[PDB]
Ligand binder design. Sequence first.
Ligand SMILES: Nc1ncnc2c1ncn2[C@@H]1O[C@H](CSCC[C@H](N)C(=O)O)[C@@H](O)[C@H]1O
Ligand SMILES: Nc1ncnc2c1ncn2[C@@H]1O[C@H](CSCC[C@H](N)C(=O)O)[C@@H](O)[C@H]1O
Ligand SMILES: COc1ccc(-c2coc3cc(O)cc(O)c3c2=O)cc1
Ligand SMILES: COc1ccc(-c2coc3cc(O)cc(O)c3c2=O)cc1
Ligand SMILES: [K+]
Ligand SMILES: [K+]
Ligand SMILES: [K+]
Ligand SMILES: [K+]
Ligand SMILES: [K+]
Ligand SMILES: [K+]
Ligand SMILES: [K+]
Ligand SMILES: [K+]
Ligand SMILES: [K+]
Ligand SMILES: [K+]
Ligand SMILES: [K+]
Ligand SMILES: [K+]
Ligand SMILES: [K+]
Lengths: 353, 352
Amino acid sequence: INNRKPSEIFKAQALLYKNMYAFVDSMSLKWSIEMNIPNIIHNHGKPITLSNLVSILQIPSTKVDNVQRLMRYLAHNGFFEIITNQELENEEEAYALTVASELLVKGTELCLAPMVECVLDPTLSTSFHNLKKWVYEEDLTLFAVNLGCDLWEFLNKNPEYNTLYNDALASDSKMINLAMKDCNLVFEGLESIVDVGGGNGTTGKIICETFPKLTCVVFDRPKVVENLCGSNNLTYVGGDMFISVPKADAVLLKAVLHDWTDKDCIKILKKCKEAVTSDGKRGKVIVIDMVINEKKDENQLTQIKLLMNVTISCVNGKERNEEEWKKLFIEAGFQDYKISPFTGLMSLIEIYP
Amino acid sequence: NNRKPSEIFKAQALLYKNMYAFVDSMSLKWSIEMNIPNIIHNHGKPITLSNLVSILQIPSTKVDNVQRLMRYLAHNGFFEIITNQELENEEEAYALTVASELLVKGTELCLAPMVECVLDPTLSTSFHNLKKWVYEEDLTLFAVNLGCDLWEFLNKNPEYNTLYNDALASDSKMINLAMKDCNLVFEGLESIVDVGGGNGTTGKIICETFPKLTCVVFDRPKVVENLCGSNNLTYVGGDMFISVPKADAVLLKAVLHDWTDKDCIKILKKCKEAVTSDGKRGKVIVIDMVINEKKDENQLTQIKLLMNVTISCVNGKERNEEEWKKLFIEAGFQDYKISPFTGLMSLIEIYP
Ligand SMILES: Nc1ncnc2c1ncn2[C@@H]1O[C@H](CSCC[C@H](N)C(=O)O)[C@@H](O)[C@H]1O
Ligand SMILES: Nc1ncnc2c1ncn2[C@@H]1O[C@H](CSCC[C@H](N)C(=O)O)[C@@H](O)[C@H]1O
Ligand SMILES: COc1ccc(-c2coc3cc(O)cc(O)c3c2=O)cc1
Ligand SMILES: COc1ccc(-c2coc3cc(O)cc(O)c3c2=O)cc1
Ligand SMILES: [K+]
Ligand SMILES: [K+]
Ligand SMILES: [K+]
Ligand SMILES: [K+]
Ligand SMILES: [K+]
Ligand SMILES: [K+]
Ligand SMILES: [K+]
Ligand SMILES: [K+]
Ligand SMILES: [K+]
Ligand SMILES: [K+]
Ligand SMILES: [K+]
Ligand SMILES: [K+]
Ligand SMILES: [K+]
């Protein structure tokens, strides 16, 4: 402002407006999903013209241009590819899917539409209007502050959401499976592994099916693995990771450490190190979680990771940058580490004792 | 749908960015409600996190949450993070940027009121029901989700008056700034007619910036029915489709975007004769958005395409340069020139 060139001031105004109206990026995405446009295009078997698209959707004539404008914006953001014969005015444009919208085709193994609808649930998403009240409350999560209940209770009293939540879990399961396929260099030489905080063993199964020779122990709290049956190379063990971790060539901590403070992670890591360095053996600890690094990642990637650190903080979680991870490893008594890609948001970290 | 893993993961990252985009908006709203811009401004220099949370009186268990929000806002351009004096010893400090200087309440160009209004819970959540809206003939987004158009809503809920008025007040300041950067446009003009001039706010800004100019605020009879103007400002009621008062120049600010091409042609023709009578040859001035993916910066096109959607929710129709050009041609004009106005609007000079 101060004695700046109007152009500079107006450029800032535009930036302000982009962030102010950023929620429309979300709502437009949600709209495309609720309208089932990605599936309609998929069913069409080729790029679909605007006229055929609104005809199938049965869009009122006074709203056809609104649909076009929405499609244009979504296309700009990478969700559709506008196919049009330049230099042929009378001819309309067509909409083709992009990798991003193919991931929105309901019924497919990797479909992220469910995750999107869960995130954009009116009740949950609107809670972010009260970030101020939330930062002034000790310990409470954003939802505890805004809804008076935790996501678990919300899930229990919202069947629609619960249905989406479960679809989202299935899809994410397929994403991890896809991710695991390129990790042969990490797992292929192991004879045994323990998935610490493994839950219902979904991850352990993926690991076992991917690496048939590897034996896996799904380790979690007793009540979590309570009446689960292990089969061929996959077994369940109940316990407390802070007290003791089952011995193995490697330990896996997937989406576990981001739920704990630095002090607790160090303790967890120490127990895991213990688990892979007994009987005169020297294995390794594998951590699958987000690694923030503004120096190594592309600016657009750092942006979503930073965004995610904010969102998870709302549920008292924490994403860490590489230096922070390094600190933890050193404090836990490890000698070195290596980071590799896992998914577009999570990385795989190998920690050596 | 056989894609490479890397393609799939990049697409997932893209999806997460868009589904969580509303947080960009909410974190911005948060910084304003926390008066962070003002706190940094008053400090007179970059503020350390410790000093910031101290002034804010943030509970110890949420200090890192505030840190993550500031880090994200900084990345998006609202703050500059300054590193510590010692190595190994983290304390960053936060400095304002041009974007956040616009969020410092009390300053002349503050846009915080605009943000607070747009991001009002009741108003902003209407966007959750875009589907219902596109299946309704003619209704605006607000009419469909609030039950009535925004004007009626404000009448029924007076509390939103100070919010809306203040937002409009911040926008006029942007207009005033823009107007003072348009000397070359109003140079040589003795008279101007603001067609669809509304209450005269724009005309007042024009006359004040150019005491040399005389302006006629032209609008529907009932719009200027009981309005009084200054010595260089007067009001005239009528219908632009029927007849537009003569003058050296005609101004159409945020008018053409709410009419179909056919009606714009009608208006533009009436404006043409308005500045080409009595053997004189003036020009028509249009202030509205001009979309151009070929000449605009990527980020500018981004917001214009977004605003293209938001404006349509109120039945507005923004146009790209090619479309504007075609309307000017069919209207009988010979040439045009587009100049910078504000961040999202341009100023087009049309020559008959
Ligand atoms: N002391 C403890 N010992 C073992 N598991 C624990 C634990 N405290 C919490 N957990 C487990 O932490 C897990 C966090 S969810 C972890 C995610 C999971 N590995 C995945 O791939 O989705 C839960 O399954 C929870 O029961
Ligand atoms: N036939 C007509 N003649 C003159 N003004 C008209 C009109 N039909 C609609 N309008 C006017 O169109 C205007 C659109 S909004 C005007 C905004 C104004 N130029 C600004 O810069 O803020 C309204 O003031 C409305 O009264
Ligand atoms: C620690 O793992 C987690 C736990 C919770 C989230 C999470 C964060 O923000 C949200 C916002 C919404 O509007 C709706 C949601 O449904 C969520 C989540 O589920 C993200 C990662
Ligand atoms: C060009 O004129 C216009 C017409 C409409 C708008 C506009 C667009 O989206 C909004 C969204 C909200 O949540 C609240 C609002 O209050 C608005 C507006 O006022 C902005 C400028
Ligand atoms: K400057
Ligand atoms: K296609
Ligand atoms: K699905
Ligand atoms: K408060
Ligand atoms: K919660
Ligand atoms: K125990
Ligand atoms: K994580
Ligand atoms: K780092
Ligand atoms: K919202
Ligand atoms: K309206
Ligand atoms: K009402
Ligand atoms: K416009
Ligand atoms: K264009």
